[PDB]
Amino acid sequence: LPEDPKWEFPRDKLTLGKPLGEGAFGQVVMAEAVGIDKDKPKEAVTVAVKMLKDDATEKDLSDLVSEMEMMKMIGKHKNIINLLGACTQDGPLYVIVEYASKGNLREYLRARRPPGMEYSYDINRVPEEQMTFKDLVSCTYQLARGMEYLASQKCIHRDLAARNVLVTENNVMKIADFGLARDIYKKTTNGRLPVKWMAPEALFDRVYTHQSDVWSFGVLMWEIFTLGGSPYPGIPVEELFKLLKEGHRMDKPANCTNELYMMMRDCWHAVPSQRPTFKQLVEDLDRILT
């Protein structure tokens, strides 16, 4: 792998830590980096490094490099997990990205559900108490702002879901895993069946567009206002195909205004060209915030 001084970070100044989780690209590990912020070059900063699992092929290795080199292309934004640097030449490939202390969004919302209406036993959070409606509309607004940035850079996400959203310690929403490569199932990875987030054109024809991500914004909105519900609850994958081309759609979440739910279904238009653009989603969510 060629050198890149603009992005290279020395492994001496990088100290690994406890693992965080795993994804389609490998595993992501907590870490600390000394001087990764050039402005404050004697400061330890908490970071997350993305690396391969101990059983990955080179197909998986080029797919880690090809996400890293795409993260350099699309720039930085407040509502995405940004790239900080990399370790290339010696040993394993580390990819250093921003750290979000409050974890991922789906389990953040599930932990803050009302008593007796939990998803699973797990552990609840009453220091966090419970979220308000205005709380919820700004999380999607932040994500619309972030999705409108990625769309403007001609980037397609292909798998936008609440589990792939991350929360910083100031409750900032950060879209993650947007540079992954596309390689043409019933395999639940990380607790989710990804086919339930796909637009019909990507589910039946395996074709993706910025409009297809708009379909996956709609489901994301449904996850948010149900505080982490699971879409199409308990429906077999074999039946979603038939149910989808029949015109059936998900029901209106409680504690959610009609105009938001009528915005939810316009993302689920059968024709991609008929779905809203990210630009008007940002216009409408801003107006609804006040």
Ligand X SMILES: CNC(=O)c1cncc(-c2cnn3cc(-c4ccn(C(C)C)n4)c(N[C@H]4CCOC4)nc23)c1
Catalytic residue numbers, as ranges: 159
Is 31 a binding residue for ligand X by CB under 6 A? The answer is no
Q: By C-beta, is 63 or 223 nearer to a second copy?
A: 63
The correct pick among 14, 28, 64, 220 for binding ligand X (CB under 6 A) is 28
Is 48 a binding residue for ligand X by CB under 6 A? The answer is yes
Choose the one of a second copy, ligand X, none that binds residue 205, judging by a C-beta under 5 to 8 angstroms depending on kind: a second copy
Q: Which of 202, 195, 155 is nearest to 176 (CA)?
A: 155
The correct pick among 97, 144, 162, 227 for binding ligand X (CB under 6 A) is 97
From residue 244 to residue 283, the character string flagging contacts with ligand X as x (rule: CB under 6 A) and all else as - is ----------------------------------------
Choose the one of ligand X, a second copy, none that binds residue 7, judging by a C-beta under 5 to 8 angstroms depending on kind: a second copy
Is 100 a binding residue for ligand X by CB under 6 A? The answer is yes
Choose the one of ligand X, a second copy, none that binds residue 70, judging by a C-beta under 5 to 8 angstroms depending on kind: a second copy
Is 105 a binding residue for ligand X by CB under 6 A? The answer is no
Select from 94-102, 193-201, 250-258, 264-272 the region that touches ligand X (CB under 6 A): 94-102
Is 171 a binding residue for ligand X by CB under 6 A? The answer is no
For the CB of residue 207, give the shortest distance to a second copy in the complex, in Å.
4
CA 31, CA 47: separation in Å to the nearest integer?
5
The correct pick among 33, 80, 151, 166 for binding ligand X (CB under 6 A) is 166
Q: In this chain, which residue has its C-beta nearest to ligand X?
A: 21
Burial track 148-183 (b if 16+ CB lie within 10 A, e otherwise): bbbbeeebbbbbbbbbbbbbeeeeebbbbbbbbbee
Q: Return the structure tokens found at 153.
A: 């850079």
CA 286, CA 140: separation in Å to the nearest integer?
10
Is 177 a binding residue for ligand X by CB under 6 A? The answer is yes
CA 196, CA 237: separation in Å to the nearest integer?
8
For the CB of residue 276, give the shortest distance to ligand X in the complex, in Å.
27
* Residue ranges binding ligand X (CB under 6 A): 20-21, 23, 28, 48, 50, 81, 97, 99-101, 103-104, 164, 166, 176-177, 190
